[PDB]
Amino acid sequence: MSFIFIPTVRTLHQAELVLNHKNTYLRVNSSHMEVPQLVEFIHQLVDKYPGQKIYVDLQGSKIRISRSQPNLILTKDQSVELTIKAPTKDTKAIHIGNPNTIKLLSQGTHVKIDDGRMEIVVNSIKDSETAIATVIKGGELKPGKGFNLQPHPFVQNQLSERDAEIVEKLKDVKEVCFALSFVCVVEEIQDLKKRSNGKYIVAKIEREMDLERLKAISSQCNEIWICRGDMGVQLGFVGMAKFVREYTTFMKQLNCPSIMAGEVMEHLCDNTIPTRSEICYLGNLIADGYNGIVLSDETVFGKYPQQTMDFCYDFVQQYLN
Amino acid sequence: MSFIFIPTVRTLHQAELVLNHKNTYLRVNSSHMEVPQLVEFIHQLVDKYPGQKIYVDLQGSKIRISRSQPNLILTKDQSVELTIKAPTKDTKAIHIGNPNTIKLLSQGTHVKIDDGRMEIVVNSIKDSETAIATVIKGGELKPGKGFNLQPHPFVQNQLSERDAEIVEKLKDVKEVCFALSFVCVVEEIQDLKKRSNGKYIVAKIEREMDLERLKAISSQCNEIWICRGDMGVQLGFVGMAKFVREYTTFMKQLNCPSIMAGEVMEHLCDNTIPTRSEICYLGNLIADGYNGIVLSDETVFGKYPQQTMDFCYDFVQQYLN
């Protein structure tokens, strides 16, 4: 078997529950803990599991509402300010966490907020920190929610100060691999290769991209994850379904392994049996030639991390014979 | 759009919640109510919805533990009697509902009971009503649980007295179509065509079958359902996943439409959003050329019957354009 499994963990205990099998490598979401805690956790894991690669998932280009954003009622048709400034008391603006965000906006850009529970259209750029938008769909704005642009330009996002720091503080741990969220261009991989001293890099594909772009990216990175979580908001459900299928048809043209991610086995977070579509879909992705799966919520949040991991392994093994 | 939707209902209210859209035809599970109630329900529906075909699902060849079976502790390695006799007080036997069952058993036949929670191997046939078996996996035997044979021979099952009655009492309602559970051979379709006066017939495929068998069946029936519920127990999860994929590769050779069934959208029984694998799998089954889906539990038991139906319709429509 060359197929692999990437279960997500955030404790030592979890790691022990999912590491029963070969071809299995931990993912750690660097959103899940503060940088010092991440560094200590990785150091513990590599002491316990020497030489075993660990995928450290960088939140990368992902855009969110600021964590210090005060709750705000946005009303349909109101004008509103979008800004990368830090939140202040009595702000009436939408405050974005990623400071590269203004440069990604243009007149006409739609932004889905909180998976589409709210929607705005950008009217103009006011200054380097601020855009003016119109609310299309209103509701209560909360800290930390998603913020997805349509269209989203294909430009180099520089790493965030936090991700740059993570890379700097982990580049001396031989086992660490980095997964870069929301890759758009090859230059983002090249930058991360340079900063990490040549480490193994995963490009996380969370949007529609043509084959030629992906060929370029695939010649610089070491692995590709198809990340259906955020792809679903970015593209909508039909657009996601279509693009993952199109990707499957041309992935063999890429020079790296392709790993399926995002709710591969979501029904196993809470339930004891996967659904018949989950099961059929996992068989089909083996036969279509995917090289592995990522387990996220199913292991890191789920009530059955060990059983989920063991089910997946047992299913694939039997499938291949 | 020629794709169709077959939601399952058991009340007038449910039927109203799922009939918002074109290309949508009710399924009624004839297990769900007594024959007189079924007959009255169908009469109500066709008064309300004249000329609209209704799929009446016959439980067919399905084998279950008797409903009058007293609870019984089966112990690993015990000998036990399997019988088609009615249950009696103090029976120590496993009592089967379908009286054709003895003829389907042979020395060496395994039977999974209650989806595999218990397992037996048949040692011999004792008499026309009774086989002797050894328990492989024990537990508490309860009325009404499933009973799946491996191997299951390809023979004509005659209809049950109950199904024969249903057919007789419904054959004069022009809208009724019959779905026959667990089809194995063309003769079962021919018989049901004769008894129903030529009605539209669905062969329910709930087992692995070669293409040539299915070509024969498909030339006599009007539609095929791939029924992943019972197929999953019959074949196991890997065997199901493999066979549905193999079926998809040759279904275009069959002369009738192919409809996907069994947990197409199971996560929507209890949850508000389908999983990313549910969504991708539904897109792929459209692109692979399935001609529709059956919704079972999702509409007849689910908390969101209307929303589930409307999601599916809206997804397919957008997919096709």
PDB file of C-alpha atoms in Angstrom, chain A residues 166-290:
ATOM      1  CA  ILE A 166       6.003  29.372  13.103  1.00  0.00           C
ATOM      2  CA  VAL A 167       8.213  28.502  10.183  1.00  0.00           C
ATOM      3  CA  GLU A 168      11.244  30.171  11.746  1.00  0.00           C
ATOM      4  CA  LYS A 169      10.746  28.399  15.099  1.00  0.00           C
ATOM      5  CA  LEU A 170      10.076  24.942  13.568  1.00  0.00           C
ATOM      6  CA  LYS A 171      12.518  24.916  10.607  1.00  0.00           C
ATOM      7  CA  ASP A 172      15.138  23.171  12.813  1.00  0.00           C
ATOM      8  CA  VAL A 173      12.867  20.189  13.620  1.00  0.00           C
ATOM      9  CA  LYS A 174      13.728  17.670  10.931  1.00  0.00           C
ATOM     10  CA  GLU A 175      10.321  15.900  11.013  1.00  0.00           C
ATOM     11  CA  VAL A 176       8.240  19.017  10.251  1.00  0.00           C
ATOM     12  CA  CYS A 177       6.502  19.415   6.909  1.00  0.00           C
ATOM     13  CA  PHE A 178       4.428  22.528   6.208  1.00  0.00           C
ATOM     14  CA  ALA A 179       0.979  22.604   4.617  1.00  0.00           C
ATOM     15  CA  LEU A 180       0.258  26.019   3.199  1.00  0.00           C
ATOM     16  CA  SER A 181      -3.416  27.081   3.214  1.00  0.00           C
ATOM     17  CA  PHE A 182      -5.096  28.628   0.156  1.00  0.00           C
ATOM     18  CA  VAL A 183      -2.224  28.400  -2.309  1.00  0.00           C
ATOM     19  CA  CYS A 184      -2.755  30.482  -5.504  1.00  0.00           C
ATOM     20  CA  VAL A 185       0.716  30.738  -7.169  1.00  0.00           C
ATOM     21  CA  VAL A 186       4.039  28.941  -7.375  1.00  0.00           C
ATOM     22  CA  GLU A 187       5.870  31.901  -5.790  1.00  0.00           C
ATOM     23  CA  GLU A 188       4.106  31.148  -2.460  1.00  0.00           C
ATOM     24  CA  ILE A 189       5.636  27.655  -2.480  1.00  0.00           C
ATOM     25  CA  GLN A 190       9.081  29.003  -3.494  1.00  0.00           C
ATOM     26  CA  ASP A 191       9.007  31.513  -0.662  1.00  0.00           C
ATOM     27  CA  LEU A 192       8.032  28.859   1.898  1.00  0.00           C
ATOM     28  CA  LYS A 193      10.786  26.526   0.550  1.00  0.00           C
ATOM     29  CA  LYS A 194      13.353  29.301   1.029  1.00  0.00           C
ATOM     30  CA  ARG A 195      12.200  30.252   4.510  1.00  0.00           C
ATOM     31  CA  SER A 196      11.992  26.660   5.697  1.00  0.00           C
ATOM     32  CA  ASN A 197      15.368  25.579   4.222  1.00  0.00           C
ATOM     33  CA  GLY A 198      13.934  23.240   1.622  1.00  0.00           C
ATOM     34  CA  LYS A 199      11.376  21.437   3.792  1.00  0.00           C
ATOM     35  CA  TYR A 200       8.668  19.205   2.425  1.00  0.00           C
ATOM     36  CA  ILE A 201       5.734  21.396   1.436  1.00  0.00           C
ATOM     37  CA  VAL A 202       2.041  20.663   0.848  1.00  0.00           C
ATOM     38  CA  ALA A 203       0.067  23.007  -1.389  1.00  0.00           C
ATOM     39  CA  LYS A 204      -3.498  23.190  -0.063  1.00  0.00           C
ATOM     40  CA  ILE A 205      -5.888  23.684  -2.996  1.00  0.00           C
ATOM     41  CA  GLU A 206      -9.032  25.387  -1.729  1.00  0.00           C
ATOM     42  CA  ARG A 207     -10.233  26.985  -4.941  1.00  0.00           C
ATOM     43  CA  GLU A 208     -10.706  26.246  -8.642  1.00  0.00           C
ATOM     44  CA  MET A 209      -7.514  26.361 -10.614  1.00  0.00           C
ATOM     45  CA  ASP A 210      -6.614  25.361 -14.149  1.00  0.00           C
ATOM     46  CA  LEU A 211      -4.344  22.409 -14.876  1.00  0.00           C
ATOM     47  CA  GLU A 212      -1.494  24.566 -16.078  1.00  0.00           C
ATOM     48  CA  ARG A 213      -1.398  26.552 -12.838  1.00  0.00           C
ATOM     49  CA  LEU A 214      -1.454  23.293 -10.887  1.00  0.00           C
ATOM     50  CA  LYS A 215       1.379  21.796 -12.986  1.00  0.00           C
ATOM     51  CA  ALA A 216       3.505  24.802 -12.122  1.00  0.00           C
ATOM     52  CA  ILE A 217       2.641  24.511  -8.449  1.00  0.00           C
ATOM     53  CA  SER A 218       3.120  20.723  -8.415  1.00  0.00           C
ATOM     54  CA  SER A 219       6.688  20.972  -9.717  1.00  0.00           C
ATOM     55  CA  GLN A 220       7.696  23.058  -6.687  1.00  0.00           C
ATOM     56  CA  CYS A 221       5.625  21.463  -3.833  1.00  0.00           C
ATOM     57  CA  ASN A 222       5.850  17.858  -2.595  1.00  0.00           C
ATOM     58  CA  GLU A 223       2.162  17.017  -2.185  1.00  0.00           C
ATOM     59  CA  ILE A 224      -1.241  18.516  -2.877  1.00  0.00           C
ATOM     60  CA  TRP A 225      -4.280  18.447  -0.590  1.00  0.00           C
ATOM     61  CA  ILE A 226      -7.729  19.007  -2.121  1.00  0.00           C
ATOM     62  CA  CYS A 227      -9.406  20.848   0.733  1.00  0.00           C
ATOM     63  CA  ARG A 228     -13.148  20.605   0.325  1.00  0.00           C
ATOM     64  CA  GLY A 229     -14.019  22.497   3.529  1.00  0.00           C
ATOM     65  CA  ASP A 230     -13.097  26.008   2.424  1.00  0.00           C
ATOM     66  CA  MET A 231     -13.474  25.046  -1.272  1.00  0.00           C
ATOM     67  CA  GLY A 232     -17.185  24.591  -0.595  1.00  0.00           C
ATOM     68  CA  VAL A 233     -17.622  28.181   0.555  1.00  0.00           C
ATOM     69  CA  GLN A 234     -15.311  29.633  -2.065  1.00  0.00           C
ATOM     70  CA  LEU A 235     -16.950  27.846  -5.005  1.00  0.00           C
ATOM     71  CA  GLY A 236     -20.377  26.881  -3.666  1.00  0.00           C
ATOM     72  CA  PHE A 237     -21.467  23.239  -3.500  1.00  0.00           C
ATOM     73  CA  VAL A 238     -21.999  22.688  -7.213  1.00  0.00           C
ATOM     74  CA  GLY A 239     -18.788  24.490  -8.143  1.00  0.00           C
ATOM     75  CA  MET A 240     -16.871  22.392  -5.560  1.00  0.00           C
ATOM     76  CA  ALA A 241     -18.361  19.110  -6.831  1.00  0.00           C
ATOM     77  CA  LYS A 242     -17.534  19.988 -10.403  1.00  0.00           C
ATOM     78  CA  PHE A 243     -13.967  21.122  -9.704  1.00  0.00           C
ATOM     79  CA  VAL A 244     -12.998  18.116  -7.523  1.00  0.00           C
ATOM     80  CA  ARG A 245     -14.200  15.851 -10.358  1.00  0.00           C
ATOM     81  CA  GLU A 246     -12.266  17.865 -12.961  1.00  0.00           C
ATOM     82  CA  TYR A 247      -9.159  17.740 -10.735  1.00  0.00           C
ATOM     83  CA  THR A 248      -9.449  13.945 -10.427  1.00  0.00           C
ATOM     84  CA  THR A 249      -9.450  13.679 -14.249  1.00  0.00           C
ATOM     85  CA  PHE A 250      -6.107  15.488 -14.641  1.00  0.00           C
ATOM     86  CA  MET A 251      -4.273  14.927 -11.308  1.00  0.00           C
ATOM     87  CA  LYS A 252      -2.154  12.150 -12.739  1.00  0.00           C
ATOM     88  CA  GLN A 253      -0.519  14.939 -14.880  1.00  0.00           C
ATOM     89  CA  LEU A 254       0.859  16.484 -11.696  1.00  0.00           C
ATOM     90  CA  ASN A 255       4.269  15.485 -10.385  1.00  0.00           C
ATOM     91  CA  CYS A 256       3.192  15.002  -6.747  1.00  0.00           C
ATOM     92  CA  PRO A 257       0.729  12.885  -4.767  1.00  0.00           C
ATOM     93  CA  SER A 258      -2.866  14.086  -4.322  1.00  0.00           C
ATOM     94  CA  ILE A 259      -4.570  13.744  -0.952  1.00  0.00           C
ATOM     95  CA  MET A 260      -8.329  14.223  -0.413  1.00  0.00           C
ATOM     96  CA  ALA A 261      -9.382  16.379   2.499  1.00  0.00           C
ATOM     97  CA  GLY A 262     -12.411  18.026   4.110  1.00  0.00           C
ATOM     98  CA  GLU A 263     -15.196  15.919   5.589  1.00  0.00           C
ATOM     99  CA  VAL A 264     -13.987  12.593   4.181  1.00  0.00           C
ATOM    100  CA  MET A 265     -15.725  10.864   7.057  1.00  0.00           C
ATOM    101  CA  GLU A 266     -17.674  13.720   8.759  1.00  0.00           C
ATOM    102  CA  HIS A 267     -20.602  11.457   9.765  1.00  0.00           C
ATOM    103  CA  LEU A 268     -18.137   9.572  12.013  1.00  0.00           C
ATOM    104  CA  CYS A 269     -17.611  12.653  14.263  1.00  0.00           C
ATOM    105  CA  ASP A 270     -20.914  11.899  15.957  1.00  0.00           C
ATOM    106  CA  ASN A 271     -22.024   8.530  14.533  1.00  0.00           C
ATOM    107  CA  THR A 272     -20.811   4.951  14.738  1.00  0.00           C
ATOM    108  CA  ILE A 273     -21.298   3.885  11.055  1.00  0.00           C
ATOM    109  CA  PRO A 274     -20.242   5.981   7.983  1.00  0.00           C
ATOM    110  CA  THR A 275     -23.048   6.634   5.441  1.00  0.00           C
ATOM    111  CA  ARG A 276     -23.293   4.543   2.271  1.00  0.00           C
ATOM    112  CA  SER A 277     -22.188   7.596   0.206  1.00  0.00           C
ATOM    113  CA  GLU A 278     -19.171   8.174   2.486  1.00  0.00           C
ATOM    114  CA  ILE A 279     -18.171   4.493   1.982  1.00  0.00           C
ATOM    115  CA  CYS A 280     -18.725   4.456  -1.795  1.00  0.00           C
ATOM    116  CA  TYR A 281     -16.926   7.799  -2.180  1.00  0.00           C
ATOM    117  CA  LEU A 282     -13.911   6.506  -0.252  1.00  0.00           C
ATOM    118  CA  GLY A 283     -13.770   3.393  -2.436  1.00  0.00           C
ATOM    119  CA  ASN A 284     -14.042   5.527  -5.600  1.00  0.00           C
ATOM    120  CA  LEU A 285     -11.271   7.873  -4.531  1.00  0.00           C
ATOM    121  CA  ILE A 286      -8.961   4.840  -4.017  1.00  0.00           C
ATOM    122  CA  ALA A 287      -9.891   3.468  -7.451  1.00  0.00           C
ATOM    123  CA  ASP A 288      -9.591   6.909  -9.085  1.00  0.00           C
ATOM    124  CA  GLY A 289      -5.997   6.995  -7.755  1.00  0.00           C
ATOM    125  CA  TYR A 290      -5.946   9.360  -4.859  1.00  0.00           C
TER     126      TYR A 290
END
